[PDB]
């Protein structure tokens, strides 16, 4: 009603509050640092780099390069203080951290419609409400949460399997079925004997970790994920000795999961474990396996692509909360909410980008993907439609970036009012 509230002056929260401000919209930005400090933080500043100083590769053929693209355009506060902070880094944006967030703290700071509030929000604020408080939200407002929407609906820690391009798997080496109780709709990549010891071996050489689980007992894994029970290999008439399953993620079915594989093994013993299985040989792995501390919403049962809550009017999440992961897709999805929660201040409907644009892969990810042990989804190529053609992968990967910079940016020019 009278300000727009903002919880949470990270990354997303930043950008949010700096939307609304650009659309002359006042804000109440509550920050509870440096009152409560979270276990990863160390300063007062908003938009604090708490780990690595990269946000990412800015290349063509880069993912998160089109998101940076996106968010420039957008003329995003983030991607402007990175680039006055930038220090050398091969094909990344690195950043002088200390500079970016002292730029961002001083250029909120210093608006005039902006009002900064030092204190912990324990309950949800009335009226129009963007929540972006990271994944380290205070316990009181994950609590809160819980009671609003449900106990199930909110995640402490993420456990997440690694995904794979579908186009990218060998299905002459697969078969789709399900186990007793199953959908019959999982990818099955069935395994000798011989193939599962070695795999086994991998994983020791290399929620419960798959590999954790792996050295506990020869037969763990036969009796969990890879369990061949009740499935039949439509190639030899019997049942497997062993199976990886995948499972789709994605409403477009670009994007399979591992069953059963979450992990926290170092990118590269992902890439070079999945390999070993049958049909993934060439497996092109878009989002790799993590397990943190990390509080996120399950954004498919409870978020729409606008990025506000589907059944409480004028409540928004961004950010880590909302289910992404990344610096980058934080401030973006901070921007998003920040533009609807603007509109709808003014008395105009939400917006999304178009699905060809990386941003708006994101957020449609995050209202239609697989809600049952829905996981955090950072910026990646199954995102976004397919470019359809017989060129090469980079070839193809540029003509996606393309194509989704100049479809946000005529997305961005459609707006009304205009971002200034
Ligand atoms: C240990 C760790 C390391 C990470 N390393 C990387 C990395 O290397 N690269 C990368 O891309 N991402 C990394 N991230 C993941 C993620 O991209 C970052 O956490 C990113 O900052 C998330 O942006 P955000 O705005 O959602 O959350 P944050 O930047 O954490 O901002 C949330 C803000 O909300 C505040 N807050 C929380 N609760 C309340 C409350 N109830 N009232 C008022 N304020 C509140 C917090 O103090 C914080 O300032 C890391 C995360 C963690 C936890
Ligand atoms: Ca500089």
Known sequence: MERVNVVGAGLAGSEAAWTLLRLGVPVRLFEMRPKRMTPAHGTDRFA?????????????????????????????????????????????????????????????????????????????????????????????????????????????????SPIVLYESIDLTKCFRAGRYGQSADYLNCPMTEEEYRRFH??????????????????????????????????????????????????????????????????????????????????????????????TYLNAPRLLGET??????????????????????????????????????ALGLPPVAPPEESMLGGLVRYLATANPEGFQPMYANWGLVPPVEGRMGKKEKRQAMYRRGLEAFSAWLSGLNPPLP
């Not at 983030?78 to 002292?102: C, K, N, T, Y």
């Not at 961004?318 to 509109?343: D, I, K, M, P, W």
Request: charged fraction near 25%; glycine fraction near 12%; charge should be negative.
């Open 307 to 344: 990025l506000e809550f589907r059944e409480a009017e004028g409540l928004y999440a961004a950010g880590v909360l909302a289910g992404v992961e990344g610096y980058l897709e934080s401030a973006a999805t901070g921007f998003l909410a920040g533009l609807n929660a603007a509109r709808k």
């Open 48 to 160: 604090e780099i708490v780990c690595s100083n990269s946000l990412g590769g800015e290349g063509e053929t880069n993912a998160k390069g089109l998101l940076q693209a996106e968010m420039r355009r957008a003329g995003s506060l983030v991607m402007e203080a990175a680039d006055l902070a930038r220090v050398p880094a091969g094909g990344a944006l690195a950043v002088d951290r200390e500079e970016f967030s002292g730029y961002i703290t001083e250029r909120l700071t210093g608006h005039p419609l902006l009002e900064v509030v030092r204190e912990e929000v324990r309950e949800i604020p009335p009226g129009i409400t963007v929540l972006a408080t990271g994944p380290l939200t205070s316990e009181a407002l994950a609590e809160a949460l819980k009671r609003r929407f449900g106990d199930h609906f909110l995640a402490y820690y993420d456990a997440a």
């Open 201 to 294: 071996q991998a994983l020791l050489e290399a929620c419960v970790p798959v590999e954790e689980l792996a050295r506990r007992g020869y037969q763990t894994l036969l009796f969990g994920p890879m369990k061949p029970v009740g499935l039949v290999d439509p190639r030899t008439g019997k049942e497997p000795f062993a199976v990886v399953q995948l499972r789709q993620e994605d409403k477009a079915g670009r994007m399979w999961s591992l069953v059963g594989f979450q992990t926290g093994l170092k990118w590269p013993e992902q890439k070079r474990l999945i390999q070993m299985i049958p049909g993934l040989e060439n497996a092109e792995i878009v989002r790799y396996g993590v397990m943190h501390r990390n």
